[PDB]
Structure formats: C-alpha cells, structure tokens
Amino acid sequence: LPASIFRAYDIRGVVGDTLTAETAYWIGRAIGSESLARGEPCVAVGRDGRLSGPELVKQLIQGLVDCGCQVSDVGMVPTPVLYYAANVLEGKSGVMLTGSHNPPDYNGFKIVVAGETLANEQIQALRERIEKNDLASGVGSVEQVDILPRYFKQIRDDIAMAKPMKVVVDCGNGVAGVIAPQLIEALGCSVIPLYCEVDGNFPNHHPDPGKPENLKDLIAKVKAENADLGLAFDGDGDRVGVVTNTGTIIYPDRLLMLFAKDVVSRNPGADIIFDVKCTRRLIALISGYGGRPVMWKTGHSLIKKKMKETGALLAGEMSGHVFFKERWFGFDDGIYSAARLLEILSQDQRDSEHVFSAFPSDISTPEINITVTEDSKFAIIEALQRDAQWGEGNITTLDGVRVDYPKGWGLVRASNTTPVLVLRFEADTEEELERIKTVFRNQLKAVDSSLPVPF
Ligand SMILES: O=P(O)(O)O[C@H]1O[C@H](CO)[C@@H](O)[C@H](O)[C@H]1O
Ligand SMILES: [Zn+2]
C-alpha cells in the first residue's frame, strides 16, 4: 500500500489511484488486529454517501471479519453517527469510511480503537502491521445495526428549544441529508432544505462550509425566505457552518464563544479547548466566564485525544469541528452542534445577528495557504522553531509557531492533509495586522528567501 494515504489524523486517498478495494481489505485487517490487541473484538463500521462507499465498505468489513472481529454494520451514516455507535454499542472501536469534504473520488478511514481516536504513529502502525504481516486471523461476524433512529431520539429528547425558528439547511449533497433536516424540524423548526439529496457526484457546490463561496447559496436563501439562521454541513457531517438572519458568516471560533458561555455557565472551571487557528478573543472570553482555556493542535483526532487528557467539556476548531462532552460523548458532530446552537438561540429574544454581534470582533485574514512539499513542510516549521525571532509576544510552538501580541496574533503551521503551510493573522487595527504580517513575512524569508509570501 502507498505510504502517502497514512496521514496524521486518519487515512485518505483517491479511489482508483492510491485507494483500491484490496487496500481497504488490508486496512480492515490492520484495524481489526489493533482492536484485538487492545482487547476489543467489537467494531462498528459506517460509510458516507460517496460513490465508492459500497465497494470499499464491503472490503473493510471483510478485513475486520477475517481477524475474528464482531462487526456492527450501521450502513450509510454521518461520521458522528458512527462515533455515536462506538459509544453506545457493545464495542468501543469503530471505523468510518469517508472522504470528508474532498472531491467525489476521494475516500478514507477515520478510526477509533478501544475508545481512542488514532493519530500520528498509531496510523503508521496500521501500515506497518500490513507490511510485517503482523495480522490477526479468525472467523468473525457481521450484524446489521440500524442506529440512526436511536441517535435522532437521543438528541431530540435532550434539546429544548423555547420557541420556533425558521432555518435554511445546506447539506451540500453529502450524507448529512439523511438526518439533519429531519432532526432540526423535530426540534421545533421549519426547515428550508438546500442540496439535501445525498449525491456522491456533488453536482452543486462541494460540501465544504469553511469556504465563503460554498455558503453563497445559503446566504441568499436565508435572505430570500427571511429565515432566522442558515446552517451548512460538510460532506460527512462532522463540520458545521453558520449564517445569521442578515447573512453574516459566523466563523467557528466565534460560534465557540457562545457555546463556551453556555457550557461554563453550568460547569464552573471547565476546560475548553480550541485550536491554534482560533481567535485570541476566545482565551479572554473563556477565562472571563471562569473556564480554563486550553489551546491545542489543529486536527480532529488530536483535539479528541486532548479532550481525554484534560477532561475538557467542550472543544472547537476553526474548521468547524465542534466537540461537546457536556450532555454528550466528546466527539465532533456538526449535527449535534447545530442542535445545541438552536437551543441557545431559541432562548434569546434577539435575532441571531444581534446575539453574535455582541461578542468582541477583530479584523481577520482569510486562511492563507502556501504550497511547499510534503517532505519539506515539517522542516520549514522546525527551522522556524529553531531560528526565528518574533519580537515581544507570547510564543507557542505546540503546532507550528503562533505568537500572541497585545493587539493581535499570527500563526504559521504545516497542514497535515495537504502539502502546504497554513497562516492566519488577526488584529485590533489594520496597522497592527500589517505589522504582524511583516514579522512573519521576514521570518519566513530568513529561513528560505525563495518561499512565497502571498500576504
Ligand atoms: O489541513 P489541516 O489544517 O491539518 O487540517 C484540516 O482538516 C482537519 C480534518 O477536517 C480538521 O480537523 C482541521 O481543523 C483542518 O484545519
Ligand atoms: Zn468532515
């Protein structure tokens, strides 16, 4: 199997190129062997709505079965629903076959073994098992499990909206259309569906709510229908995007402000995690409400590990992965997060635009990406960590280099899904934004005067 599909957070490739039916089989063998090594024969398996789902999922399941595993096949579900299954069924292991928000031919695996989401050297360990033939053999079993109704009822019965709302829901032709519109209506909303038919060809916009262009249709519809809110899901339902009644995009770091207030109000002193791409305004806001802000590495699998380590009641990433432990299970879930948002908004007399505009804002860049190489991105970061001078500031190197200044902050880090450096900048004023950009531009050029600096 190609090494390149074994990534930091999970496995991902292109079907017909780096991911075939046979590699899905051996990945199933490897996961089953690792689960058994951790004492867990019981494994849930789910898939998203991609074209390659049926072909690859059968092989994944056979690989698990051929270890001696007891597989619970939950069929076509959102990623969080597979995570739910791995929390409520017999077994604490689960595999989701998904290509996330990527183009149609992409697929991959998100993997939980005996309660832990695998990352980094644990994903490499799977590849290594296959190479070594360090694989279990046995005669396992498959049971079909219809888990969606349980998940639906679990959420519906713990969410208590105080008034009706009208909501536009954009599923981007991904798998969130099997439940999100239905569940949101059942909470007590009217729902206007956009692209809620599951279609692995993704013929409209790609289901990636992190890009403003993929929210254009949602914003227009919210305005046309005088809706209270717009919601967008990514292809597998573990990420959410939000638009107010006036069309304002609420980026997930500011969504987390509302959620943090809510969670900490019932849980004094609670740890709240956010990734290094999130606004500095979160640190102060969480602290102000008496929570403990914990900044951590970008990447869903890494955030999930960190919530175990810290006992955090809530986590969020700038990409829109949001992780409730309070009243929930601790995994990222766009659908559940949407429900939690609707609950909070429904108890406020103000419209969603005014609820969010009350919170402090800074001037922010769009994400900046610089393409480098897969085999050099980490060395560039290492060189910056070794050599760079940032002036006076609070320097964090837990993921790349982030510097928090009195009036703003900047970040440079390596993506773990693409061969790029990722940068963000925010500040109180345009002048400070430019000062910080200049510091980062000059430190990049000091490492390699040939690096693009497209900011
Ligand atoms: O490419 P990156 O930045 O490493 O990772 C990106 O994809 C991951 C999977 O969606 C998310 O968890 C990160 O928040 C996102 O930034
Ligand atoms: Zn996703």
Curated annotation (Swiss-Prot):
PROSITE patterns: PGM_PMM
Residues given in the record as alpha-D-mannose 1-phosphate binding sites: 9, 300, 317-321, 413-417
EC numbers: 5.4.2.2, 5.4.2.8
Modified sites of kind Phosphoserine: 100
Cofactor: Mg(2+)
This protein's pathway: Nucleotide-sugar biosynthesis; GDP-alpha-D-mannose biosynthesis; alpha-D-mannose 1-phosphate from D-fructose 6-phosphate: step 2/2; Bacterial outer membrane biogenesis; lipopolysaccharide biosynthesis
Knockout mutant characteristics: No longer expresses O-antigen LPS side chain or A-band LPS, sensitive to serum, resistant to virus E79. Has no phosphomannomutase nor phosphoglucomutase activities. Does not make rhamnolipid.
Effect of residue 100 to C: KM for G1P unchanged, kcat decreases 24-fold; G1,6P stimulates reaction by 2-3 orders of magnitude. No stable protein phosphorylation detected, altered ligation of metal residue
Stated family: Belongs to the phosphohexose mutase family.
UniProt comment concerning the protein's domains: Consists of 4 domains; domains 1-3 have a similar toplological core while domain 4 folds over and closes the active site from a hinge region. Mutants in the hinge region (residues 262 and 368-369) generally increase KM for glucose 1-phosphate 2-fold while reducing kcat about 10-fold.
Miscellaneous comment as given in the Swiss-Prot or TrEMBL entry: Most crystals have Zn(2+) rather than Mg(2+) and are catalytically inactive.
Record-given protein name: Phosphomannomutase/phosphoglucomutase
Organism: Pseudomonas aeruginosa (strain ATCC 15692 / DSM 22644 / CIP 104116 / JCM 14847 / LMG 12228 / 1C / PRS 101 / PAO1)
Origin organism lineage: Bacteria, Pseudomonadati, Pseudomonadota, Gammaproteobacteria, Pseudomonadales
Gene name as annotated: algC
